[PDB]
Subunit: 314 residues, 3 copies
């Protein structure tokens, strides 16, 4: 199977500049090269260039709506394209607002996909519930069918079509949810495993359940949207919204190895890696290295080791 | 329900000055205010002023016996008082010797209470077994019925009445126990989950059993005495007796969320937070922040999120 | 029962000098003295003096073959000797190549022994599969019966006799395995718990099964070979091959406490502690302290506490 890396150096989804440097930092670590060493074929599509919408006035509270909507429309296009050719899309972010485009484009080709959202945040605020206008805190609101018409249309997102329902998504690692967001996920009956469920069950049982929940009936394409702040600030410090008590490096890796084992990984997002937020060069190195480690993991790298088939090492 | 904060700026229970500053430093973090944001009514009783007993000679090995027994007699009074009014007591300390007063006063009103002691220590040394005269290594000895008469009466503690038996207490997080203390907990058949049991079972199963053990037959008021050193020095460094290999921030929070879910929390102690023992300001900030986080947790704050009832966020 | 400490200040098994200082550093921490405080009788055999083989040319890729084979022949002798006298052998290393001698000698006296290998590496590369000629990446190859004749004889190891088969060994903590090694352990059906299995099962269940696997049928002497890099670099940084995502101090201690409880510990190895690789003195202190802590644990130190029998502390 093929892999196509797509860089999304975008940061208008939030107020801290830096996330646009995420792709550069990930490639600089040898991500693409390290991927070619796996059993997959890799093609690097390079970084999309996002056209900045001049005079992007704030829609009520929402900041940079048009710039965000446009960059996402463009990304959804690219993704739909590579997904059309039967290749696996890997978006390297900027901020989590690019999940809108990433998942939209993917759904066009695989309408029956399910989404595994690894984050410390639900990112489901609607333009009416956000305390800040930041759109990287709203990605899921624009994608849920059940949320259609529950908030005013936003300048630049008219092209978006709610592709997935509350029954197709599972959250893992929640630990920082707004009152609004909590109301929403409780009301819509969305399946989630907050850090408290992970503590109670263990990452093992958590994955076993999300799989029987999303794939119990029909086997379908899996879209993994991974926010790096889903792991504890001790593993991924260089992010815009670090929340203490998060997933461990081991847990993160366990998640990615299980998803690889399902053979259903179709799309992947590596978001929120911000190089400029590291307090020491080492903190940036730590964050990038584990981001790379989680990606290689999605594509076969196991902790028990790997050996090329048909080669007799003796 | 009502919550009443009682500050216990006392430190004679041990040799390191600093713990008196715990209260000051927990309020400074915004705790009281943060508590008012929960579904509880909060009243801050302020900090008790402890009268220093002049010429407090050491009883054999035991240091500052009268001063300690005195500040405890006074605390037990205050606690018994608020407990009588049907409010939940939250003592913010100084050292763990104040658990004597805290639990004594609580028991006067709710004689059938059980105690969940989160510490890395058993704090059950008798005046005859301590290697140091330090009284905050002896709280539980003065409270156990089964230990009555097994040690000399102590100047200042004649007012204390063993209110609980070995069947009403459960230890969680032990990892630094003296030979003497080990003998005692083994001989009296006290239920405990050392770090080794936590490793083996997982915090989930640990809580499940502590509940079926203490509440299996009769549902009773729960008194949670939490020594901040119960968590690993990486989360709560600013304490007088840090022991490596302790509970994690996640596990500490899991404990408190489960106790909140029982609806039986009656009394709470947040002890041993010493601001002067932080090697860097950040270490004090870390310690205080997680102390506050554990308190809010006891009173409702969940990691999956919270939303006010009856408010339609859509 | 008796304990005999044997120092193995050897480092030719790998390229980084420093591991020879491991014993000196473990004793300096008070290891021997702290051991005497346990219910065991301790005799310190001192450090073996290894004769350096001049003109030690590299057998193909393998470096220092004769020096390594000679130091191991000598070690196996010393170990066979103390094992014969019915005492428990504890080897303090240098590098992990000394496990060849350590286990060989042990097997001579207890041919039915099983080996519990705690490492992040399988250390099972054959002289034909190593990318580097380093012999401390090959210990297990020289000890497996199933690997006999699968690689050329090596200058200096003609005295070695494959003593254990693939069904007598269990790996715990693997996370850095070469393609070659992976092929081997998969082909020979060796039982192992990589970090992913530990994540899924929990150290508790992991130990439960390793015991039913190795001791289900016959109870036999246990040889624990512990590579300090088996724990996360955050607990044991001072090693030559740190790999992120390892066992936690708690998990390491759980392992040793369970092995103590079986009453079958016959042989023990504390390897790879390199004092010169610490970035700050504290990192060396951290490493040594936890090495000592795991050793004391093997011989009775429990986290719940310990009290001498027959002494009434009241
Ligand atoms: Mn996000
Ligand atoms: Mn996030
Ligand atoms: Mn205490
Ligand atoms: Mn304590
Ligand atoms: Mn090794
Ligand atoms: Mn190793």
């Amino acid at each position: 199977k093929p892999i196509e890396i797509i860089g999304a150096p975008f940061s208008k989804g939030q107020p801290r500049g830096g996330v646009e440097k995420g792709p550069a930092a990930l490639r600089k670590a040898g991500l693409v090269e390290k991927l070619k060493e796996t059993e997959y074929n890799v093609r690097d599509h390079g970084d999309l260039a996002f056209v900045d919408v001049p005079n992007d006035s704030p829609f009520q509270i929402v900041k940079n709506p048009r710039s965000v909507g446009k960059a996402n429309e463009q990304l959804a296009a690219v993704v739909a394209e590579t997904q059309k050719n039967g290749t696996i899309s890997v978006v390297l972010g900027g901020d989590h607002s690019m999940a809108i485009g990433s998942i939209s484009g993917h759904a066009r080709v695989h309408p029956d996909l399910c989404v595994i959202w690894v984050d410390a945040h639900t990112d489901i605020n609607t333009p009416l519930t956000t305390s800040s206008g930041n759109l990287a805190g709203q990605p899921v609101a624009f994608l849920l069918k059940e949320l259609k018409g529950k908030f005013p249309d936003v300048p630049g997102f008219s092209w978006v079509t709610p592709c997935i329902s509350a029954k197709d998504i599972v959250y893992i690692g929640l630990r920082d949810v707004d009152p609004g967001e909590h109301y929403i996920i409780k009301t819509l009956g969305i399946k989630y495993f907050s850090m408290t469920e992970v503590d109670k069950l263990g990452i093992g049982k958590v994955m076993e359940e999300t799989f029987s929940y999303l794939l119990g009936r029909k086997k379908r394409p899996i879209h993994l949207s991974f926010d790096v702040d889903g792991l504890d600030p001790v593993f991924t410090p260089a992010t815009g919204t670090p929340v203490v008590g998060g997933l461990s490096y081991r847990e993160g890796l366990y998640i990615t190895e299980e998803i690889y084992k399902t053979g259903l990984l179709s799309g992947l997002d590596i978001m929120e890696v911000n190089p400029t937020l590291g307090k020491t060069p080492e903190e940036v190195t730590r964050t990038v290295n584990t981001a790379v480690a989680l990606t290689l993991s999605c594509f076969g790298t196991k902790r028990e080791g790997n050996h090329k088939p048909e080669t007799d090492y003796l």
